[PDB]
Design a binder for these strands. Structure first.
Lengths: 98, 223, 149, 100, 86, 195, 124, 25
RNA sequence: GGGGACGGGUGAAACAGGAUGAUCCCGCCGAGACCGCCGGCCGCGCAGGCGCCUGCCAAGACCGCCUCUGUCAAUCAAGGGCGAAGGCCGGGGGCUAGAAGGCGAUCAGACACCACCGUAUUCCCGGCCGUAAACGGUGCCGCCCCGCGGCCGGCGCGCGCGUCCCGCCGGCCGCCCAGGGAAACCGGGAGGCUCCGGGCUCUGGGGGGAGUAUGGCCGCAAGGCUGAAACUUGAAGGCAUU
């Protein structure tokens, strides 16, 4: 049986996509199939943010954010709970949930 | 800190003074060892480079200033003061990430800029495209003709602004942010564009005996 | 469908139902036939002769105003292209890609377009040779193509 | 654009205007003033280049270099022989790329 | 007449590698090249590095088995760019 | 006769007197008969011209480079071989040249070199193929051929010498300070073997 | 007002204080000289303990404040700070020390060489 | 990959067989 | 240059590295690859494939048209060209990973996974090879076919008028009413088909033996393309459901 119309990849009108590597596994994964969750976090944890913010002698400097695109291989994603195995019914849902 | 008072015992601190353009010229104190062998303390502190936020340089609006960081290098250790000159300008890594958003197209230009003082500089300029005020289509993608019109606009404007510029005024143009603003006016007419600014300005070639220039920049508040 | 590409497009020209000359147009058959003859003196191709009559003059359809198409007018005067323009225009393209190929030996993509263009020149030539609009002796080779243009 | 015109101008001249291909006929034509434009080549032998450019200055007849090669010029005039110097002894149709 | 076109002189001798290498080099050595000066295909080799046009009558220094060589074509191009700069 | 690269006869005005002085120059590839070879500190950058190494922009292939100024050529003289301008130190007035072996040598900026690479490139690509083809190569050069192996020779004739089974019998590697008759084989070998 | 480079990565964490140029170091100590278990060198506990010893040195060298430069292993791998980074930063605040500026200094590749592990990845 | 591993095994038998035919010519 | 005891590595480790002062930090420098984030239900290409910056060259599809010709067409053995990676050949190059090799830990044994070092390779130029789950597992040209979307490139319409709106043509797509199908599903077809016939090529005929044997052709080789039989067997398989 064919599990997904997409085939697990977003390749449309193309025959090849640029390879990327899992950040955790290091497996080469075509760009279309990578999980690709972008994260914008803070340079220090919120629990330390209060104390760092008090420490700074500068007038108005916020803890500067860290931006990284994490791209994960399928196995790395299911093991680290980035994505979950869903039912044939909910597999179609595309909107980011929670 | 260690002169008044095992390796640190034999040391001294020689204060570093920034170019006159910056409101807080005093920046830091550099640790040096006491003279031994053929290793005089002044020779070691002569070519060190310090990276200073424009917020620390001109203390004021962090939002409008602290994102840019200037590299200033000692050129003369005179009167115990490590006088410094431009070694580069750069936006912080946090500014660099904040500028990129999926759905947008990025135009990024680099130009070799020649100065009267004999420095070849490299301007790394970053630009981004944004949504129109009343646009149904969600993604801010521009057709190729506009991107090339935009690429030309930054290249032409940079010749107009930094083409005949000398290092002393360039440092003030880079710290007053006029060049970023002229580039935004030029790009604005072509298409709505955001974050048009210079990401970095680095010295490809530095002239020798730049000491007369160093006097004009570090000192000579009049000039 | 395009002969040498997996591309489908329809951008045709829709000739009017009326095959009779327009009221605003004031050109007699001789008046436009004269323009066609002077345009042949400039050497303009019949595709351009038809366009020039359409825009500078108002004769959008020549056959409507006259009784014959541009090349019928030319053939009657014996002033028609010796090599039909369609083949000639392909031959210009074949030499132009061949010139570029002489400088660059690694444009495999350019070489491919040449095989397709050359294949048309052969296909249209066999039709033109059978119709006898081309002398039966005519052969498009390739190396000798520069002289043929 | 200028190149597109250069190829077009010499093809229209071959069919419409008179011209002479070769150095000897060119020296003869410039000297009598019967040349309107003279087009040289990149590989013109150097003495011939100077002589044609002096006698062209003395007759005030424009001399322009072709983008390249006696061979490439020759294929442009439509011939299978190399042409170092070609002289436009009269243009029936189009002489726009005689710029300066 | 088939695979060993100019290397038939050697006969069944010297092995395939030498004959295949010779076929490339010997074809290039015996070839006619275009004079840079007269633009005619009459340059032929007199000795390694010495190539003479039989129409232009000009002798030019060149590759041992080719009038021009791949390292040298790169060098002229770099020299022109660098000369334009200085 | 022995060079695998062409030479060139170039005529120069006699600066001392009234005649024309002829010089023999390794030909850089591209030198043609009737070419204007300039030489000097105001020379332009064209193939065949001789300029001081400091004057030559960096990345330029150069041949017949002098190691020490006024030596009239010492480096980059064989067929196809060239050197490369790498860096100019305008405080020491010295230049780094990439030697044809890839070693890098600081040389005075007042040393002179010819722009271009030695002509004759690709000469060793062709197999000699025959032993006669090689007899001709060496007759023009020196008595260095045919080459006999010591293992074939007798103990009196060579150190590898002669036993019952043609063996070297001891390591080929010989010290750098091995005396005259003994320094035979691989000398001061840092390593040996294919890799 | 020195610069604190906390390199926090899997395997170990290094807290180094140098002065603006970075040419001279005013004291450097790393977690892993504070713990006997190889697995706990990247840990926050060792990094907190490590900073406390560093705090003593920079309060005896006149280093009142630091500008932090937390970096990950980075290069063509990592790009996420190890557990040691937050712990050391908190210790720097806990033992006085104003933090004037914080920046991401991780080496990042604009295009890169192949990381190890093969096209099938680390198959553990 | 038993099909890919069968093909390799077939190939290392066919090369052996091709060698054996070459001994007898 | 600084400074001082460990550093790597992991699941935990261990072999390597470090007072010849490593790791770490900075100041530089060399070399070779690589083109990040932007970067996609984006686009282009005949497929394989395609992403630095500048300049140059030739092309290409789409669209618009009262331009030209006048069937010049559709598919196709034979025949030509192209064709990821790995491989091969003759040179260049050699950073990174890294088939082989060696190694430390494992485990009954691992020679494997994991750590470390590393040759071919990776990369360039000139040829070979001719294969991939070379996929949409779906040949090509043509026709009608039901709505509701998104994107993309042209074009035109409306309006004061904004990257607005409605269409048109072409491409990429999602969802889908019928219809079909053993279902999965497909609906820009896999629909208009037992009510079975628009045209052209290719291929299959239970599971193996076997893509083997042999002959041929091709390749430098590896191998490709073509291609059996004797013999054995009651199932092998598809998609669904507990």
């Amino acid at each position: 049986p064919v599990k997904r119309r997409n085939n697990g990849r977003s390749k449309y009108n193309c025959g090849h996509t640029n390879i990327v590597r899992c950040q955790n596994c290091h497996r080469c994964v075509p760009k279309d199939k990578v999980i690709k969750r972008f994260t914008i976090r803070n340079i220090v944890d919120n629990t330390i943010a209060d104390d760092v913010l008090n420490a700074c002698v500068i007038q108005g400097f916020a803890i500067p954010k860290l931006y990284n695109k994490v791209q994960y291989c399928v196995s790395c994603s299911i093991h680290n709970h980035i994505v979950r195995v869903r039912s044939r019914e909910d597999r179609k849902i595309r909107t980011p949930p929670k | 800190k260690i002169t008044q008072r095992d390796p640190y015992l034999k040391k001294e601190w020689y204060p570093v003074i920034a170019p006159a353009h910056f409101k807080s010229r005093h920046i830091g104190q550099t640790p040096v060892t006491k003279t031994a062998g053929l290793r005089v303390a002044t020779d070691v502190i002569n070519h060190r480079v310090y990276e200073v936020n424009l917020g620390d340089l001109n203390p004021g609006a962090e939002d409008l200033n602290g994102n840019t960081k200037f590299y200033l290098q000692t050129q003369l250790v005179s009167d115990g003061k490590c006088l410094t000159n431009f070694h580069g300008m750069d936006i912080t890594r946090h500014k660099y990430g904040s500028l990129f958003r999926k759905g947008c197209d990025c135009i990024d230009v680099f130009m070799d800029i020649p100065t009267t003082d004999g420095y070849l500089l490299r301007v790394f300029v970053i630009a981004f495209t944004d949504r129109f005020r009343f646009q149904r289509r969600k993604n801010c993608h521009v057709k190729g003709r506009v991107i090339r019109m935009m690429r030309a606009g930054i290249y032409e404007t940079l010749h107009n602004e930094l083409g005949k510029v000398s290092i002393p005024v360039l440092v003030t143009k880079l710290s007053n942010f006029e060049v970023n603003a002229k580039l935004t006016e030029a790009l604005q007419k072509i298409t709505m564009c955001r974050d048009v600014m210079i990401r970095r300005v680095k010295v490809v070639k530095r002239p020798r005996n730049t000491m007369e220039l160093l006097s004009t920049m570090h000192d000579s508040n009049q000039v | 469908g395009r002969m040498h590409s997996k591309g489908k497009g329809i951008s045709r020209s829709a000739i009017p139902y009326t095959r009779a000359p327009a009221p605003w147009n004031k050109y007699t058959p001789e008046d436009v036939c004269e323009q066609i003859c002077k345009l042949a003196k400039k050497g303009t191709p019949p595709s351009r002769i038809g366009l020039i009559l359409r825009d500078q003059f108002a004769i959008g359809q020549v056959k409507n105003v006259t009784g014959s198409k541009i090349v019928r007018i030319l053939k009657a005067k014996g002033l028609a292209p010796e090599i039909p323009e369609d083949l000639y225009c392909m031959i210009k393209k074949a030499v132009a890609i061949r010139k570029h190929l002489e400088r660059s030996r690694r444009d495999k993509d350019s070489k491919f377009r040449l095989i397709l263009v050359e294949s048309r020149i052969h296909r249209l030539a066999r039709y033109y040779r059978q119709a006898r609009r081309l002398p039966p002796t005519f052969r498009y080779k390739s190396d000798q193509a520069a002289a043929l243009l | 654009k200028a190149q597109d015109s250069i190829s077009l101008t010499l093809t229209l001249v071959v069919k419409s205007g008179k011209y002479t291909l070769g150095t000897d006929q060119a020296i003869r034509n410039i000297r009598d003033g019967k040349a309107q434009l003279v087009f040289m080549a990149n590989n013109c032998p150097p003495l011939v280049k100077s002589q044609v450019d002096y006698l062209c200055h003395l007759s005030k007849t424009p001399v322009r270099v072709f983008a390249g090669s006696s061979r490439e010029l020759g294929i442009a005039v439509g011939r299978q022989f190399n042409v170092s110097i070609m002289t436009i002894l009269e243009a029936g149709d189009a002489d726009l790329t005689s710029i300066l | 007449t088939k695979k060993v076109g100019l290397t038939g002189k050697y006969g069944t001798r010297y092995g395939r590698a030498a004959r295949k290498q010779l076929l490339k080099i010997e074809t290039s050595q015996k070839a006619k090249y275009t004079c840079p000066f007269c633009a005619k295909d009459k340059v032929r080799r007199t000795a390694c590095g010495i190539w003479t046009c039989r129409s232009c009558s000009k002798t030019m220094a060149g590759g041992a088995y080719s009038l021009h060589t791949e390292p040298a074509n790169a060098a002229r191009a770099t020299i022109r760019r660098l000369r334009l700069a200085r | 006769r022995g060079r695998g690269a062409p030479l060139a006869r170039v005529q120069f005005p006699n600066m001392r007197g009234e005649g024309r002085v002829n010089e023999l120059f390794i030909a850089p590839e591209g030198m043609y008969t009737g070419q204007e070879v300039f030489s000097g500190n105001k020379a332009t950058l064209h193939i065949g011209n001789i300029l001081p190494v400091g004057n030559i922009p960096e990345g330029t292939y150069v041949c017949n480079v002098e190691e020490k100024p006024m030596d009239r050529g010492c480096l980059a003289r064989a067929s196809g071989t060239y050197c490369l301008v790498v860096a100019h130190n305008m405080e020491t007035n010295k230049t780094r040249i990439r030697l044809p072996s890839g070693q890098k040598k600081l040389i005075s900026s007042k040393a002179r070199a010819m722009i271009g690479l030695v002509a004759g490139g690709g000469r060793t690509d062709k197999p000699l193929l025959k032993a006669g083809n090689a007899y001709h190569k060496y007759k023009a050069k020196r008595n260095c051929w045919p080459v006999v192996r010591g293992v074939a020779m007798n103990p009196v004739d060579h150190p590898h010498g002669g036993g019952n089974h043609q063996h070297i019998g001891v390591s080929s590697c010989v010290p750098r300070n091995a005396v005259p008759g003994q320094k035979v084989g691989l000398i001061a070998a840092r390593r040996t073997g294919c890799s | 007002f020195a610069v604190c480079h906390i390199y926090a990565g899997k395997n170990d964490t290094f807290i180094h204080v140098t002065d603006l140029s970075g040419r001279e170091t005013i004291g450097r100590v790393s977690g892993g000289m504070k713990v006997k278990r190889h697995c706990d060198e990247p840990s926050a506990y060792a990094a907190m303990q490590a900073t406390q010893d560093l705090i003593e040195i920079i309060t005896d060298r006149g280093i009142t404040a630091v500008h932090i430069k937390i970096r990950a292993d980075g290069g063509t791998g990592k790009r996420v700070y190890g557990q040691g980074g937050s712990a050391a930063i908190r210790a720097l605040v806990r033992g006085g020390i104003k933090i004037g500026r914080i920046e991401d200094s991780t080496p990042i590749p604009t295009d890169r060489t192949r990381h190890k592990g093969g096209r099938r990845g680390r198959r553990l | 990959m038993r099909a890919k591993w069968a093909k390799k095994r077939m190939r290392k038998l066919k090369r052996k067989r091709r060698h054996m035919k070459a001994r007898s010519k």
